[PDB]
Structure 1
Amino acid sequence: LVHVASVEKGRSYEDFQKVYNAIALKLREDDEYDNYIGYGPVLVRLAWHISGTWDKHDNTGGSYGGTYRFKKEFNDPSNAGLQNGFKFLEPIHKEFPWISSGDLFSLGGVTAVQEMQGPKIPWRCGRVDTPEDTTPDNGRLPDADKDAGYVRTFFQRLNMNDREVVALMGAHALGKTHLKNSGYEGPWGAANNVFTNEGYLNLLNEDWKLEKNDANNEQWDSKSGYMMLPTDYSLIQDPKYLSIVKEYANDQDKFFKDFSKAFEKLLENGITFPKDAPSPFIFKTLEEQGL
């Protein structure tokens, strides 16, 4: 199964920076969603869930096909709540009818990290929409109630190594869990929408408590109002994982650099780039543009 990238006809950098600025400008404007967290965290959850379906053995799933627009995937129980991000992006796709589904779902993910002041993420255009029968079956996304052995094995399928998995997981400092979407709840009072290494610091300095929630599921709670999933608490339980968590809690610049490489690797898995293709784009933020 080969997926070759194909630039939207005649488009260059300047065109994608317009679509970036439209997403960013709506991110600033619709600031009230989810008790003033805004849409940034669910847009990077969407980019991760449309790519997280990839399988390195047969090259099915991944961000290239834009198959999330189809009922089977949009109704995946693992994607409960992400309809909110899709409806956010929908006026923007109407405005730029020429961008493919895959490129828009992954650019929303890039834009959200940079506008929430995380690292720059190089991005590459060219995903092509594919037919409804290429929609991957439900069940390729991870369970939250598990341990380090499960996370390590799950991520081998996206061939992510330990250091890439621990950097990727730092995004769980953003947003919150919602009992009606996943059966987990919290953080309580002040959820975060700035991108920082704070999750690693909290994991190592909070006093955590294994409690059971209103959906009868167990999670780790802290006196301060912070929570963690079983799969998140895994990172201090495993010796290889814990030594990388200590590395990032003590160096926010090495964390930003390593996240940017693993997040771009995640959005690009499964795609073949022709050697005459444009170099990756680095988009300016509204703040660097004075907008």
Structure 2
Amino acid sequence: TLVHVASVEKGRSYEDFQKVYNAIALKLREDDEYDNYIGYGPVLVRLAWHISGTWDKHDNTGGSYGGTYRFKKEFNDPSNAGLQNGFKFLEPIHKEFPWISSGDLFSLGGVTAVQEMQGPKIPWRCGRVDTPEDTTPDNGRLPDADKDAGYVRTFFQRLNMNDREVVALMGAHALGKTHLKNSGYEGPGGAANNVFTNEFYLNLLNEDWKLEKNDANNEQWDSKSGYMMLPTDYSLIQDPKYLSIVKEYANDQDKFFKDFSKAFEKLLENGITFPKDAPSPFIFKTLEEQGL
């Protein structure tokens, strides 16, 4: 398996990264019209996950380290359709801060989005290093949505995630929406789709779901409230082990926040070796905490 050692951008420290965080956060506030006023928060979270979710624990291919989403093979992955919006959002950030690596920028985008949307603090570590075009993972490593709980469970073993980690991570599906033109699925998972809450779990348990076909001829679960769940989302209440965890997070906001924070940091760090003398993880202040 490949070794990717975190290497701090030369001479940079917490304050440098807080400035990048702030620039992302200010642009999130400014560019509010995007996606019928959802804003860019959700797509940045999805970008951070997709650049990380190519990882394979077996050989340390893929993962956030190399920033390989910048290469055509990966940005043109059908699984990544729509993420170009997140990349374009981050372009002026990268122009202002050309010293940050691509993997650091993409992952920090996700952290910033979660926190600015009132989610948990997510500790974040710098030191991802851009790797060459030939290190770009092939398409097909990101998950299908038309599958069942067994598929989800097996899929996430490749990312070294257990049942609790999987169910926690999936709570991000409160954010944003599915777009028919991107993925063949349409609609949001709830009402508060640019605020980070545990609504995904409450909606799974409390809505009256009907298995319908959308306009792309794909099945999805729909409620009269106008919400949807992917087959993979709904699988979390079909499987008895996932169901107990869904109930736990539906009943404990703080526990969900803490578990999501750990799993999301882990996701963003998979594949990276941090030297023993590497800086401790950074916890960035929100704009609100800074009075900005």
Specify if TM > 0.5. yes
Aligned-residue sequence identity (percent) comes to 99
Q: Secondary structure at the match of 1:210?
A: strand
Contact 2:174 2:188 in 1 (8 A): no
Contact 1:80 1:182 in 2 (8 A): yes
Aligned equivalent of 2:271: 270
Contact 2:65 2:129 in 1 (8 A): yes
Inter-CA distance 107–219: structure 2 relative to 1 (3 Å threshold): same
Q: Distance in 1 between matches of 2:83 and 2:200?
A: 22
Contact 1:172 1:199 in 2 (8 A): yes
Deviation of the 1:263 alpha carbon: 0.2
Contact 2:45 2:114 in 1 (8 A): yes
Aligned equivalent of 1:148: 149
Deviation of the 1:245 alpha carbon: 0.5
Q: Secondary structure at the match of 1:113?
A: helix
Contact 2:122 2:265 in 1 (8 A): yes
Contact 1:60 1:136 in 2 (8 A): yes
Aligned equivalent of 2:193: 192
RMSD, aligned CA = 1.0
Deviation of the 1:76 alpha carbon: 0.3
Deviation of the 1:187 alpha carbon: 2.8
Q: Secondary structure at the match of 2:221?
A: strand
Deviation of the 1:188 alpha carbon: 9.1
Inter-CA distance 190–235: structure 2 relative to 1 (3 Å threshold): closer
Contact 2:175 2:189 in 1 (8 A): no
Contact 2:178 2:188 in 1 (8 A): yes
Aligned equivalent of 2:183: 182
Q: Distance in 1 between matches of 2:232 and 2:188?
A: 16
Q: Distance in 2 between matches of 1:75 and 1:27?
A: 24
Inter-CA distance 178–119: structure 2 relative to 1 (3 Å threshold): same
Inter-CA distance 113–130: structure 2 relative to 1 (3 Å threshold): same
Aligned equivalent of 2:88: 87
Contact 2:190 2:200 in 1 (8 A): no
Runs of at least 5 residues in structure 1 that lack an aligned partner in the other structure: none
Contact 2:119 2:195 in 1 (8 A): yes
Contact 1:176 1:191 in 2 (8 A): no
Deviation of the 1:191 alpha carbon: 5.8
Contact 2:64 2:103 in 1 (8 A): yes
Inter-CA distance 135–189: structure 2 relative to 1 (3 Å threshold): closer
Runs of at least 5 residues in structure 2 that lack an aligned partner in the other structure: none
Contact 2:189 2:229 in 1 (8 A): no
1:32 aligns with 2:13: no
Q: How many residues align?
A: 291
Inter-CA distance 25–131: structure 2 relative to 1 (3 Å threshold): same
Deviation of the 1:189 alpha carbon: 9.4
Deviation of the 1:271 alpha carbon: 0.4
User: What are the superposed Cα offsets for residues 239-267 of structure 1, whole Å, 9 maximum, x if unpaired?
Assistant: 10000001111100000000000000000
TM-score (norm 1): 0.99
Range moving further from structure 2, 184-193 or 212-221: 184-193
Inter-CA distance 15–242: structure 2 relative to 1 (3 Å threshold): same
Q: Distance in 1 between matches of 2:190 and 2:125?
A: 37
User: What are the superposed Cα offsets for residues 64-85 of structure 1, whole Å, 9 maximum, x if unpaired?
Assistant: 0000000000000000000000
Q: Secondary structure at the match of 1:48?
A: helix
User: What are the superposed Cα offsets for residues 11-31 of structure 1, whole Å, 9 maximum, x if unpaired?
Assistant: 000000000000000000000
Q: Distance in 2 between matches of 1:262 and 1:197?
A: 15
TM-score (norm 2): 0.99
Inter-CA distance 132–140: structure 2 relative to 1 (3 Å threshold): same
Deviation of the 1:192 alpha carbon: 1.1
Q: Distance in 1 between matches of 2:131 and 2:42?
A: 27
Q: Distance in 2 between matches of 1:61 and 1:220?
A: 32
Contact 2:174 2:189 in 1 (8 A): no
Q: Distance in 1 between matches of 2:277 and 2:204?
A: 44
Contact 1:211 1:219 in 2 (8 A): yes
Deviation of the 1:59 alpha carbon: 0.3
Q: Distance in 2 between matches of 1:277 and 1:211?
A: 50
Deviation of the 1:9 alpha carbon: 0.4
Contact 1:37 1:191 in 2 (8 A): no
Q: Secondary structure at the match of 1:219?
A: strand
User: What are the superposed Cα offsets for residues 203-241 of structure 1, whole Å, 9 maximum, x if unpaired?
Assistant: 001110000010000000001111000000000000100
Deviation of the 1:132 alpha carbon: 0.2
Q: Secondary structure at the match of 1:281?
A: coil
Q: Secondary structure at the match of 1:106?
A: helix
Q: Secondary structure at the match of 1:254?
A: helix
Structure 1: 4+ residue segments shifted above 4 A: 188-191
Q: Distance in 1 between matches of 2:105 and 2:128?
A: 9
